[PDB]
Amino acid sequence: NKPFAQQTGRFHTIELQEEGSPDEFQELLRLQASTQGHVDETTLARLVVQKRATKAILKKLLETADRPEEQAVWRAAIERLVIGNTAYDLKDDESFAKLIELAKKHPLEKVVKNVREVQFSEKVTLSDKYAFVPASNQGRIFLSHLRRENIYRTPTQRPLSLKVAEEGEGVRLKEMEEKALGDGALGILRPQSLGLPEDYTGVVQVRGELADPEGNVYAGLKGTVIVDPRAKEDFLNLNDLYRGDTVVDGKKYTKEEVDALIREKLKTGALQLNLGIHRVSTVEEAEGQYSMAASHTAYKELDPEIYRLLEEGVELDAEGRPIVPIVIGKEMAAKLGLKEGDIAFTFRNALLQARVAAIRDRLNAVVVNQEYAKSTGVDFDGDTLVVLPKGLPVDPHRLEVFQTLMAHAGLAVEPSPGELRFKEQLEVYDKVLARLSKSRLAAELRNAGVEDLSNPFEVVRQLESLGEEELLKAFKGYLRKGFAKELGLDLKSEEDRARLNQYLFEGFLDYRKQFQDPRRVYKKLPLMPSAALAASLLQVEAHKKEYDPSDPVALAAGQLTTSFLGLSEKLAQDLETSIDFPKLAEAIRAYNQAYSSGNEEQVAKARAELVKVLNDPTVQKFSLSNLLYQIITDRKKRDYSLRVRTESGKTYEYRNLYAVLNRLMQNLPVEEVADTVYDASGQAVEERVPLKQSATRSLVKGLLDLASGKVKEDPDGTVAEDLADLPVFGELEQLYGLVADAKYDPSSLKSALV
């Protein structure tokens, strides 16, 4: 309902972009289009984030001369401010006095127009949208800026307060494997303890913190919990909380160092958990219905049938479309007309075929194994799965297809077959089957309608399907004597005999209820040779780097550069209308076949065919489009870059993804907008970034005082044409101070700005 900053009180929040006012960053971004990609987006982003934030912090520092002890917290979001020639070290009671002095005597947009430098506190955490600063200086908040924005900017409803302790009544803090309850998941507590309607049974998405009476907060939490009355204690996994890795009072405290501090407070019974609910998992319609996704691993304890069910593999159907075990609720199973064993479909708000393996009375999640839906990138912090009925009015894609496209685009690589869930059992069965097929008993079976004896799950099914109890005792009795010999068990020894029925039935035959063909049910799904190929064709990857953690602009600057994820997505859709998915699919199926068991000529020819479909320009651009969308989405957290390795042998690094997106769009070569160029092994052959930066600060200065007449030149063929008639122009002028120092050769300005 409102930001967890405000529902908890930790931080004060000031907005960075005012009411409906124009996006000055979207405008600067067409300096990137005019220069054909030779300015630096994240520098443009910096100038904007420094302006927007300096203005906000002043305007607050003025509306807050009346609430004057609340002002003092905003004072220390800015250390030193250079306006004109005078410099204002706000820590001085002197300088600060003077700063608020001129603050009133001149209107805001003129004070900001003149700030030449600004340095922010370690205390202010800047983002694309807000400036957060902590409420009281008394305590200390042991998490990094990235995580404060992560945890505290989300809207949650009114925050609860739960006791943490190890013995007694409260919440307990186990120390298990990381992600042990699934990735986005960080705890299992009872519906009652966080105040939900009696015996709720689902998952709920929270934004909690872990604090003490004195105002120190040691870990913050972001993700979901699993609500369930069937579990005994309310417990949070500690290794899934965000703690440490930050600098309190000049020292970095590591994860490990803060984890020590918690165990010491926890023992003293002075450690709470302030938790805010953000969305409670209903089951609501979409046809189709959907709710949140839980990992089956968070059920080995409570309801281990669910755990063990989704643990025993996924089966590829006869056409290669994986069928994945899910577990749905009563409500859902109703409205969508499904019962145990029904094949449905599911996708995250790739479209996979689902096999219902269970139905529960009070469940309102959709519980899946995550390793088998990694192809729909399900994330157990809030992601929702949709289920559609058995009606199947669509074409669900093959494992090779998308697994091959996903790989061509750097988001998966070497051809491995799977791990068969039933490997050793099926070898035994094939040894026995040799003899069975020769026997009289096999003639009897084929006379009663069972022709193909190769699928034991089918022979047993098709039997009990049609009468034939005697032929079933005979088939079941045959395979006993068979496996017992095959495994050297003595069939008389009553504990050796219970070991057969343990191996043949309990471990093998009974799974005929979940799977259709044992020969196609996998423990580790395979990697099709076409996708290992597809990945060797494009050398595109998403290289990780953290935003400078010392400097609070880097992140907010970074988040502004995300603000065209729109165009990255239209590029994908507009692109995919072209690709003939028919021929893509056949060319892949050709290769994977001719790979597995094919002659030498075809493993040659199917290779050259698929390759020519994969090197097709519209395919390459489609896959490259898909990568960029992931990178841009991830730059909302880290300084990710694109890297590409070309026929030159060299690899190019990009963090100007808006120029990359334009070049892809207008079918221009993408290499000149690269930031750094590396030499095969050799690195740093060309570092283009420092040039691109001071160029940016020049062109901005140009664009600005060309549009305002301070340059006697023709603001006409240029991007300054009509700028000064536009609302956004009043905004851009508030960042003239930060680009004043720059210089530009006035002749070549008209050329740059066209």
Numbering used by the authors: 327 to 612, 680 to 742, 750 to 812, 821 to 1162
Give me lines lifted from the publication on this model:
Many bacterial and eukaryotic viruses with double-stranded DNA genomes in the realms Duplodnaviria and Varidnaviria encode homologs of cellular RNAPs (collectively denoted “two-barrel RNAPs”). The TMP-fused virion RNAP transcribes pre-early phage genes, including a gene that encodes another, non-virion RNAP, that transcribes early and some middle phage genes.
Several N-terminal fragments of gp96 containing the RNAP signature motif were cloned, purified, and tested for the ability to extend the RNA component of an RNA-DNA scaffold that mimics the conformation of nucleic acids within the transcription elongation complex of other RNAPs. While the shortest gp96 1050-residue fragment was inactive, 1200-, 1360- and 1540-residue fragments extended the primer. We crystallized the 1–1200 and 327–1124 fragments and determined their structures at 3.1 Å and 4.4 Å resolution, respectively. The structure of the 1–1200 fragment was largely the same as the structure of the 327–1124 fragment because most of the flanking regions not essential for the activity were disordered, except for two helices at the C-terminus (1125–1162). The overall architectures of gp96 vRNAP and gp64 nvRNAP are markedly different. In contrast, gp96 vRNAP contains no defined domain at the corresponding position, resulting in a clamp-less, flat structure that heretofore has not been observed for any RNAP. We hypothesize that this unique structure enables the passage of gp96 vRNAP through the narrow channel in the phage tail. The disordered region is likely positioned close to the RNA-DNA hybrid duplex during transcription elongation and might dynamically interact with the nascent RNA strand, moving similarly to the clamp domains of other RNAPs.
